[PDB]
Write a protein that binds this ligand. Structure first.
Ligand SMILES: *[C@@H]1O[C@H](CO)[C@@H](O[C@H]2O[C@H](CO)[C@@H](O)[C@H](O)[C@H]2O)[C@H](O)[C@H]1O
Ligand SMILES: *[C@@H]1O[C@H](CO)[C@@H](O[C@H]2O[C@H](CO)[C@@H](O)[C@H](O)[C@H]2O)[C@H](O)[C@H]1O
Ligand SMILES: OC[C@H]1O[C@H](O)[C@H](O)[C@@H](O)[C@@H]1O
Lengths: 514, 511
């Protein structure tokens, strides 16, 4: 009490750093990019090697792109399913360890500078199928774990729908499920039973393949955790029309009486607007079952990742809605999103979540208030920092603590590529703010600025750690070809990036991110 | 409703920057440091010129040290009064504009490269006194404003005590008020009346001089505001024993029956400051009226105010007055948030900066945060220890004031010059350094690049000066508080410096 003596240990009663405030860094690297002989990266030895290398740098976060089955262009953002894993990421060597293939059955290696998905599928799928077949034919330990996975209720609430959808899509020659015969289109119960009987094998194999992905991914994730590395995933806010997600939950979407979307996704203008064309959620319909679809989706995201970015997070506050009739985006209108009640339901259903809000571009007051109300960090991207003036939110002096800072994302050129095409006056602006040595090392200048930020989390693409040019760019938006193909050059092994490792560690040490 | 349409003006509903979050910068410069002929800086032409220069740089804050009457060493932190102004800051030329002196009466100029207080007093006091005398003898506008000032209740609750204390101190040859005869020591009413009769002139002149300080300071402060400059003051948490503050409010302090302090201020590993301490629970009983009045006077003088040794509001070190070493003392519980409750109840919205340096405890941080006061970061302290040092830019917070150094630190050049090697190569990795001659701009730039909302630079570092321009060296008793801007350097002569600051403020969004 006021005036009185303190206990004798007053002088030692110091503030202690909050553990949840710990500064950290990480690397954005999608597993398709790993080296190896089978035309695409996978969840085998290169993933563990990369984890060991990441750990040796002092980084404690690994960010991946969505791990869903991609479209035929390779895009993880136009996946065929929101919850399934990309089975082309399955390691054939790991399957040999599991006793599902023998070494002699492995294909002759191929050189694939870049991922060609068609090539990877022709090479790998037959062998994955054969492994999945032996798994299902066996009795024993591994079979028993398939059955647990399959009968686990939090797997089956998406897996069975996904397997039936895939069986029907395989059986039928049709553009999309809109064109399916009515009993399959609208999931008549006896039609579904008839499908199970006639496509039983396909369904069992599909499920077995999802088990193999899950098993190999969970080993990667447990290895990461043992080495102090959290994994940060990614999810687009919208899912595609031709998927089990929509087909098996039509009432949760804005579809007409025939199952065609009334309204589709997009954004307004500069431009004539931008038309994405995804189906939209019936948010008030979802409100009525306590948002169960989204709750299940987050439960699957938790199963895969420690943390998850949500692309186009602004859509939870307000979304642009275009008449599906239209061929241009400008015709739509803004609609009211579910707001915080969604995240209330999720937290009630799943518990504590770690979400990152992708909140780039022009966003409204309600977006910022929603993001803050659930305590989600937003993003800063240094590549965007040098247009306009000193109020640009991407400049380090405007960064916030609860924020994730990138040098660039998978949608941007590499730092070297970006530097190379940078117009004068954005460039001399950058030169004043950044500490630049030689231009060849421009990517380290930007890395350093990200690390020096007050943002709690700094994330760098592997391409920039390797100092690579525009040919290593992962994606160029609004192009339909040449994306998602980058792989680490077959010469660069994780055993040979110790200079890079040391340099990162020096920076992380200097800026308190170890 | 979820799903329904937004109004049509949704696309234009953008976040707006909060005006109270505006990034800004400023300069620490105490007015005694201004150039001029009368042996000390003052509230005349140089103050206005400096404000014009500050404005031309884009800075929007001017920080000063306490404006109280200093001790004979010049220290504004061991003042003779907590609320009075330093009358040696009064400008003689401004008095001529007021018609209280004529130009002919102004003294011959003297060279005073540094402030000598004794020299300034001999030169200026006779003329200030003469001005004060004409003011009280006159019958017009200015006289009428003296009377309003004098009878204004928020002036008289400290001014009358201050004037009587000064009159008694003048009349008596005594070390301190402890040695005064009982009726004056304990303020017997008839003794106070006898003082008024016998020292009437002294008291009226004292009051008039405080009016002249107030008037000149308010003019400086209005001029600052007209040019977009807020003024940030400073106040020490403790006041000195030999002052009206203690004498007229004995019950609010920890004094024995005879009026001698039971306990005095300090800090452990120790350092003995020797100020009387507050009787916080006694203060609790009149809703902290003494502190409330103090903040009211701080509001009158400044837009914002730093409080030195802010940790003392949560816990303070208390040494037996008996002692003359600090290590024999104990930590006591401070008033905490209930003090600031009372202040805000009494005065309204305040803008306080917590001086929260050195080793501070959990309760200090929780109190500071509970009232939303910004704390400090000082780049000169950033390079000892490791990357968790709170003074490193990457650990700065928004609600914070960052300095290159304070008046207690060497200049950046002086600091660089004595810096040991571990710390120096550490600094070289964090800072962007060109030549050693410009080390102060490297640090200025780092302050400006911080996320801290307010960056404050001493004028000595803008001028790139060495250790001889250091304002104060703690725990020394001589050679402090004397620095003046070199008589060669005029504000008309610092456009390069102005431009260079403006470039940096523009780059880091502080304009
Ligand atoms: C955020 O979401 C967008 C989609 O709205 C992604 O865009 C990429 O993927 C789509 C589908 O393959 C493609 O149409 C775009 O050209 C491409 O930019 C972003 O990658 C996400 O960050
Ligand atoms: C913070 O407080 C102390 C004392 O209130 C000031 O210290 C200066 O003044 C005292 C008293 O004149 C002297 O003993 C010290 O050596 C000197 O540093 C600081 O300047 C304030 O910032
Ligand atoms: O320079 C004197 C300083 O000493 C200590 O660091 C005190 O905590 C601080 O209140 C004071 O300003």
């Amino acid at each position: 009490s006021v005036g009185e003596d303190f206990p004798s240990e007053y002088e030692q009663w110091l503030p202690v750093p909050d553990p949840e405030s710990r500064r950290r860094a990480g690397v954005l690297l999608h597993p398709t990019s790993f080296r190896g002989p089978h035309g695409i990266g996978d969840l085998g030895e290169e993933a563990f090697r990369f984890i060991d290398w990441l750990h040796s740098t002092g980084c404690s976060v690994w960010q991946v792109l969505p791990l869903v089955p991609p479209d035929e262009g390779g895009s993880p953002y136009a996946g065929q399913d929101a919850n399934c894993g990309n089975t082309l990421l399955i390691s054939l060597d790991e399957l040999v360890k599991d006793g599902l293939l023998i070494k002699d059955e492995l294909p002759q290696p191929i050189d694939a500078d870049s991922v060609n998905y068609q090539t990877a599928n022709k090479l790998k799928s037959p062998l994955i199928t054969k492994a999945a077949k032996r798994l299902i034919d066996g009795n024993g330990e591994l079979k028993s774990k398939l059955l647990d996975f399959r009968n686990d209720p939090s797997i089956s609430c998406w897996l069975e729908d996904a397997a039936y959808f895939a069986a029907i899509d395989n059986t039928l020659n049709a553009y999309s499920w809109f064109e399916w015969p009515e009993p399959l289109k609208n999931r008549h119960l006896s039609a579904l039973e008839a499908i199970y009987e006639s496509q039983k094998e396909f369904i069992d194999l599909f499920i077995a393949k999802q088990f193999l992905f899950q098993r190999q991914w969970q080993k990667v994730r447990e290895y990461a955790r043992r080495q102090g590395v959290d994994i940060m995933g990614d999810m687009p806010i919208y899912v595609g029309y031709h998927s089990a997600d929509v087909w098996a939950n039509k009432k949760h979407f804005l579809l007409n009486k025939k199952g065609f979307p009334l309204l589709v996704s997009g954004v307004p203008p500069s431009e004539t607007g931008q038309l994405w064309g995804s189906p939209l959620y019936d948010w008030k319909a979802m409100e009525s079952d306590q948002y169960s679809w989204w709750v299940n989706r987050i439960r699957r995201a938790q199963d895969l990742y420690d943390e998850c970015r949500i692309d186009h997070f602004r859509g939870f506050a307000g979304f642009w809605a275009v008449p599906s009739e239209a061929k241009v985006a400008m015709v739509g209108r803004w609609k009211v999103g579910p707001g915080k009640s969604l995240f209330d339901a999720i937290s009630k259903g799943v518990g504590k979540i770690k979400i990152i809000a992708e909140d780039l571009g022009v966003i409204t007051k309600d977006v910022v208030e929603l993001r803050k109300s659930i305590g989600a960090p937003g993003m800063a991207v240094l590549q965007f920092a040098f247009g306009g003036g000193a109020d640009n939110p991407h400049l380090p002096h405007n960064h916030e603590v609860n924020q994730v800072v990138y040098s660039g994302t998978h949608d941007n050129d590499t730092i070297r590529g970006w530097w190379d095409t940078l117009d004068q006056e954005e460039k001399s602006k950058a030169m004043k703010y950044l500490s630049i040595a030689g231009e060849d090392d421009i990517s380290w200048s930007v890395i350093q600025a990200a690390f020096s930020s007050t943002a709690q989390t700094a994330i760098i693409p592997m391409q920039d750690i390797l100092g690579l040019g525009s040919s290593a760019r992962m994606n160029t938006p609004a192009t339909e070809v040449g994306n998602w193909g980058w792989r680490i050059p077959s010469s660069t092994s994780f055993d040979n990036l110790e200079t890079e490792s040391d340099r990162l560690r020096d920076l992380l040490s200097l800026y308190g991110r170890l």
